[PDB]
Amino acid sequence: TLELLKLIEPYVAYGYPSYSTIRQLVYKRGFGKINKQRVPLSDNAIIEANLGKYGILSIDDLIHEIITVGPHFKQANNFLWPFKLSNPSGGWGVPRKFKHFIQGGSFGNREEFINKLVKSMN
Amino acid sequence: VLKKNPLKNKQVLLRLNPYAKVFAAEKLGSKKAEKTGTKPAAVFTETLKHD
Amino acid sequence: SAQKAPKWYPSEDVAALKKTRKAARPQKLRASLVPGTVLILLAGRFRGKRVVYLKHLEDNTLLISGPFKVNGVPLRRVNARYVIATSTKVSVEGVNVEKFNVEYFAKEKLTKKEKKEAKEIKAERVEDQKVVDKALIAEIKKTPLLKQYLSASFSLKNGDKPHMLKF
Amino acid sequence: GIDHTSKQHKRSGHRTAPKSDNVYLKLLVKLYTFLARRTDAPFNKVVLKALFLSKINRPPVSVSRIARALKQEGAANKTVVVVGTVTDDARIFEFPKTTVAALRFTAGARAKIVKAGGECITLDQLAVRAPKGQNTLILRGPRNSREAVRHFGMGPHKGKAPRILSTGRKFERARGRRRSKGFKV
Amino acid sequence: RVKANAAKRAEAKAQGVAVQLKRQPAQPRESRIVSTEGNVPQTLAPVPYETFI
Amino acid sequence: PSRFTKTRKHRGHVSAGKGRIGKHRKHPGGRGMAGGQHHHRINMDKYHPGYFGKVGMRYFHKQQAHFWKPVLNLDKLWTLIPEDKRDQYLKSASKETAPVIDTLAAGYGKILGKGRIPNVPVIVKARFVSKLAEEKIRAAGGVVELIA
RNA sequence: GAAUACUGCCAGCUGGGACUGAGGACUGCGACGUAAGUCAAGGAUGCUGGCAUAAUGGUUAUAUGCCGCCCGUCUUGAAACACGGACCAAGGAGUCUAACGUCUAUGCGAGUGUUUGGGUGUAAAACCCAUACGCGUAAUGAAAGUGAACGUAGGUUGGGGCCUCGCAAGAGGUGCACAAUCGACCGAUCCUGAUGUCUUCGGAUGGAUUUGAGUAAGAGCAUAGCUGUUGGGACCCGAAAGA
RNA sequence: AAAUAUGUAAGAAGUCCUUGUUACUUAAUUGAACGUGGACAUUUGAAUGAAGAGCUUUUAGUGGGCCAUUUUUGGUAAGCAGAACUGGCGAUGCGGGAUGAACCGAACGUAGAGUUAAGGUGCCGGAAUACACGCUCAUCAGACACCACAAAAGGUGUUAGU
RNA sequence: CCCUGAAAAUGGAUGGCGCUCAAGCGUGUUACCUAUACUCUACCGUCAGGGUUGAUAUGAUGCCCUGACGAGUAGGCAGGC
RNA sequence: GUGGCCUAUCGAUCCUUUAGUCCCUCGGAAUUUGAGGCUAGAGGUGCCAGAAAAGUUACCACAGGGAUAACUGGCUUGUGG
Numbered sequence A: 001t002l003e004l005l006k007l008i009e010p011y012v013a014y015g016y017p018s019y020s021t022i023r024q025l026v027y028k029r030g031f032g033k034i035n036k037q038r039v040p041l042s043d044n045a046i047i048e049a050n051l052g053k054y055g056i057l058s059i060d061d062l063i064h065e066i067i068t069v070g071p072h073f074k075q076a077n078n079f080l081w082p083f084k085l086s087n088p089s090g091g092w093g094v095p096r097k098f099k100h101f102i103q104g105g106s107f108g109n110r111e112e113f114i115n116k117l118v119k120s121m122n
Numbered sequence B: 001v002l003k004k005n006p007l008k009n010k011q012v013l014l015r016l017n018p019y020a021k022v023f024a025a026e027k028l029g030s031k032k033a034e035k036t037g038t039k040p041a042a043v044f045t046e047t048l049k050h051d
Numbered sequence C: 001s002a003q004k005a006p007k008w009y010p011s012e013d014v015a016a017l018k019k020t021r022k023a024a025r026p027q028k029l030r031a032s033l034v035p036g037t038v039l040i041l042l043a044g045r046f047r048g049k050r051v052v053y054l055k056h057l058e059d060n061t062l063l064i065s066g067p068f069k070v071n072g073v074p075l076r077r078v079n080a081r082y083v084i085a086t087s088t089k090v091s092v093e094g095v096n097v098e099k100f101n102v103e104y105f106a107k108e109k110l111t112k113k114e115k116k117e118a119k120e121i122k123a124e125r126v127e128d129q130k131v132v133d134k135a136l137i138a139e140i141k142k143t144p145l146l147k148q149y150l151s152a153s154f155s156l157k158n159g160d161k162p163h164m165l166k167f
Numbered sequence D: 001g002i003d004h005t006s007k008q009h010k011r012s013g014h015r016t017a018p019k020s021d022n023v024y025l026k027l028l029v030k031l032y033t034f035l036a037r038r039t040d041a042p043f044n045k046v047v048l049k050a051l052f053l054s055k056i057n058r059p060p061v062s063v064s065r066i067a068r069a070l071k072q073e074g075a076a077n078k079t080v081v082v083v084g085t086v087t088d089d090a091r092i093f094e095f096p097k098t099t100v101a102a103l104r105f106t107a108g109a110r111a112k113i114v115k116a117g118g119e120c121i122t123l124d125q126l127a128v129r130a131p132k133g134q135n136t137l138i139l140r141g142p143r144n145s146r147e148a149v150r151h152f153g154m155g156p157h158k159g160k161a162p163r164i165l166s167t168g169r170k171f172e173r174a175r176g177r178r179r180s181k182g183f184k185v
Numbered sequence E: 001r002v003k004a005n006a007a008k009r010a011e012a013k014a015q016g017v018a019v020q021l022k023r024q025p026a027q028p029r030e031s032r033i034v035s036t037e038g039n040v041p042q043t044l045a046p047v048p049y050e051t052f053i
Numbered sequence F: 001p002s003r004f005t006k007t008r009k010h011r012g013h014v015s016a017g018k019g020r021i022g023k024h025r026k027h028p029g030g031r032g033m034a035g036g037q038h039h040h041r042i043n044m045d046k047y048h049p050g051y052f053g054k055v056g057m058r059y060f061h062k063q064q065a066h067f068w069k070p071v072l073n074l075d076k077l078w079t080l081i082p083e084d085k086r087d088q089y090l091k092s093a094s095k096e097t098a099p100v101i102d103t104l105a106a107g108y109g110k111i112l113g114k115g116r117i118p119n120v121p122v123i124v125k126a127r128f129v130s131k132l133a134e135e136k137i138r139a140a141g142g143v144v145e146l147i148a
Numbered sequence G: 001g002a003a004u005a006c007u008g009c010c011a012g013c014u015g016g017g018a019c020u021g022a023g024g025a026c027u028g029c030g031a032c033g034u035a036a037g038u039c040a041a042g043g044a045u046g047c048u049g050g051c052a053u054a055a056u057g058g059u060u061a062u063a064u065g066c067c068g069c070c071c072g073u074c075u076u077g078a079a080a081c082a083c084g085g086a087c088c089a090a091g092g093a094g095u096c097u098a099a100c101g102u103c104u105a106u107g108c109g110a111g112u113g114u115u116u117g118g119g120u121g122u123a124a125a126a127c128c129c130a131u132a133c134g135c136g137u138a139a140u141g142a143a144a145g146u147g148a149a150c151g152u153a154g155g156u157u158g159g160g161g162c163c164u165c166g167c168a169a170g171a172g173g174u175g176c177a178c179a180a181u182c183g184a185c186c187g188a189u190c191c192u193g194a195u196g197u198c199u200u201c202g203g204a205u206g207g208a209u210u211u212g213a214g215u216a217a218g219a220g221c222a223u224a225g226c227u228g229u230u231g232g233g234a235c236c237c238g239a240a241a242g243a
Numbered sequence H: 001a002a003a004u005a006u007g008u009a010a011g012a013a014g015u016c017c018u019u020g021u022u023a024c025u026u027a028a029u030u031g032a033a034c035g036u037g038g039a040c041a042u043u044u045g046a047a048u049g050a051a052g053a054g055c056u057u058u059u060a061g062u063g064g065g066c067c068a069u070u071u072u073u074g075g076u077a078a079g080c081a082g083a084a085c086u087g088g089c090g091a092u093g094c095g096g097g098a099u100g101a102a103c104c105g106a107a108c109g110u111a112g113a114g115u116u117a118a119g120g121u122g123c124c125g126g127a128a129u130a131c132a133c134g135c136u137c138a139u140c141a142g143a144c145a146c147c148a149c150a151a152a153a154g155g156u157g158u159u160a161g162u
Numbered sequence I: 001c002c003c004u005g006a007a008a009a010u011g012g013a014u015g016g017c018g019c020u021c022a023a024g025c026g027u028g029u030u031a032c033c034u035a036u037a038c039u040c041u042a043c044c045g046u047c048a049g050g051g052u053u054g055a056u057a058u059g060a061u062g063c064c065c066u067g068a069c070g071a072g073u074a075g076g077c078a079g080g081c
Numbered sequence J: 001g002u003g004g005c006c007u008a009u010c011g012a013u014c015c016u017u018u019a020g021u022c023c024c025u026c027g028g029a030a031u032u033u034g035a036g037g038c039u040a041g042a043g044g045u046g047c048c049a050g051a052a053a054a055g056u057u058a059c060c061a062c063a064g065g066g067a068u069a070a071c072u073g074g075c076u077u078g079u080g081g
């Protein structure tokens, strides 16, 4: 997957998310892929019905499987619908997005500042 | 019919995650840390202060 | 026939509403708004008048009486969002005001015919006004220039910025 | 904007109803829509889909084919189900006593089945007797035996029938079909 | 690799079930302690430009 | 009927479905089978191999009635007996009273042997018969009587 | 020995502003409660005022702010210093037919098609009908000719559905259509050449890196429809010519 | 002898054990191909995704292209002519480049609210005549990519430096 | 950085006005402005997946639930006037 | 070893001719000439998937083409200055 990230570096911003970021992201924008449909989680019973066969019984179980990359991370992550974030509330912080974060832009690995970016985008 | 955001609307926030009341009652978001008087080694200090 | 018929007719029965989860909890007034505070009236027929706040009513209105002896404003209700609460305060622990409620200020049963299509204060209102404001006058006379301040009207002057004013 | 990975608004590509206006076929479809929704038997779903098919997708099923199916071990007492027409076959000289449910029976097929001591029944009679398709055996006729299929995929060395009106010597048996006249296919 | 997989399964039938037959990509490295003992860090700097001719 | 045609749907659209560049013209590639060896060669060779050239010998003044010989197979042989008596013939298969099936009056010239008739003797009258058809009839216990 | 900055966390508290109020008995998940019950918990209610009509709103004209090049066409590219168009009304261009392909609907089904004709009639209608004929039910070969079961109409792989067991996965059995494959059968080609004999006929039996638009428990016929094809004036208008 | 690009594999149509068929093959009961029986879930043999997968029939328009980055041929060169890969325009509006087919951003049902992209914030013109460190004075200053040009060569002009 | 090198024809173009510790050039840090783009909501349509028949509904290509989508010449098909 | 060490060295339909099979047909029988068939080569199309083909027009015609020349303009500036 690191080679994939290298291959799409000019089009994405990525980094290492913190537990606060993951929890807020899943609580605010968490949607399940149930029968090919985008289903708002909004209740622990939905998660038990679709992920309980992996022992995931709650939204905190799902978050735990995300934050510590567990044995069933693939299934939990794929169950999670891709997050639809907004534009950052205080902006991108740079004049031009499409340079590397290292060169004063936005794309590439900004590893720990991804938390700040995602909080503004959430 | 409406997605209600946790992180607000404490009622939905507590419908999910029953542990949230224990978290907010014990103030687990402001956990006081223990005191340790560990000192960095001198070699670490000179390396940091070098040049 | 000029139009055949609707094969489907909508049902004529009106659906009942769902149960609403909206209880009515009491209003939370501002902190500066305490009984005895002088208020500046920002709207109405008494625009700019200095009045004394007396009581919070159950319809969320404020019972004011800037005494006739000072500025001619009788016992009446105002809306909390249309007054400015100042910093000057008179003691209100000597006036009886529980008797004044919404039923005290009930106006009239307007109908579809009893209207002034082309073109008398009650004795209990006059006497209640005198009884309430005698003790207000006694409190007002206890500090210099309060009666004159309460008799004068508020108005903005030139170069007077209300976002930086202190009241 | 969204980077679509598949065609949008794509219809499933399967019939959801018979194209025909036969009110009786539509009543059969109503019955098996109810049955396929309210039962968990896959048989009812299979029958419901078969009721949508076109004429070429419901080839006739001969009584010889029915008898050959009843020849299978343990199939002697099963109810044969044909969503389509059952036709008569004079090549076969003996029939067992059996029950056949079909949309249509030819006069000869019906006479032969009844004469053999069996019974011909409609699909609603089948639904009443076997609501979950109990002890049934669905038979389907040969689809690619149609004459039009002879010409599908025509091309050099493909060995398909040319679309041709008159047949014989002088009709496309020359240059292109033999080595002595140019080349062969 | 097929032969090795069969042999690993045969041994895991005796002991150590769930013998992890699938290959995995290179994982990120785990924590580690790096000792300065006999390895005091040497400070490098960029070098000035020289013509070499 | 005209109201269900695409002509009605093309009303209001300039080119009537024929394209702005191509411009539906009179005969852009010739009439009929023009150019079958030249600019329609690929079509003719892919879909109609054998079209060009001659094969075989001519036949002056051919009368199709000379070649009249409809074929009937043994599996359809018993259909020539009416249903009201076929059953009584299939039962009591007797060498002494066997049905006579006159295939020429039935309108056939030759009896072919796709076979598996029941083991019941029959006198089959025909102009022509294949080896296998005669063998299967005789093995069932009947006979083939040749007629003209 | 402390503070503070910076960074990060809180399922910390709280004030101001804007937009939205979709749904319409109940059902759910919860929360607070000792319980009864209540609630911000599967989408707005409560209270109050004015007006009750041109007041809101619609239409229309104008003004203002910002924007807005002339359509049609050919074309890589049209507002074009490319062509047609002064204006308006009426007319004005993918049709019908013969023979067909695919698909679809319908009737009947190893058959199918009454309408050439006859009978009949309330008379170009409707109704009824014999013998033929067309296509289909057999192919193959230039032709003379010959002409489709070793077998449960074969074996193998898969296969929906069904059957048996089964708390439930699942495991067996049977497996139509369909797909791949190895065979068997019919005709052509090449070869082998028995009994027999008008001694040159006949061609049993067996075979093959050959070949067919075949068989292997028929699927067709007829009518109608959209689309497509060919001939026709053939979407409409248009030569210089020829007789 | 690279980089980029490119073929294949990563298993049930598999692996193993035993012994069945043949007219092929072997000196041979040796193999070859195809098999009968028997043993193989935490992972049935790397990752990620999968929007349903597979299959068929039939028919429209088109068969003048052009532009950008990069590779590249002829030519002094060309808004020239000719190739490669990709993305575009053609067929496409929208915000920005004043203006413009192709550039930047972003692709479009009808609306409301919020946040932004590229580009901007003296006035035209919505938005700091913001903050900070310097440089420059031109009797042809300069002022944003594509893009609407400038060179060799010079100056005790002035500023840093070896 | 500025100046010389540096010449074309109607009057004219950092877009214009104008700008000189800039409103120019290089660089840094923030705040702010606004697209048919992103987020949330409503409504229209389309596609998909579903529910709905033992006295319960105009008696079902109806009613309803859920999710996601929506540029378009030549062209194809569908529903309508 | 199924021509040339490998990568080029070549040719449809109709027609004629030859070889093969001694085979099929000439349709009212039959024999012998003659003719026609089936399988395999050759005779040739070099515009090489393959018409049988001389000019002229300053007397000219038609359908069209800015898919394309003969001015200006535009890009370029070898050459000229």
Ligand SMILES: C[C@@H]1C[C@@H]([C@H](O)CC2CC(=O)NC(=O)C2)C(=O)[C@@H](C)C1
Pocket: J013, J014, J015, J043, J044
């Ligand atoms: C040059 C000579 C003749 C030539 C050929 O027959 C010429 C034409 C004649 C004709 O009218 N039509 C055709 O199909 C062919 C051929 O075969 C060569 C070998 C020998």
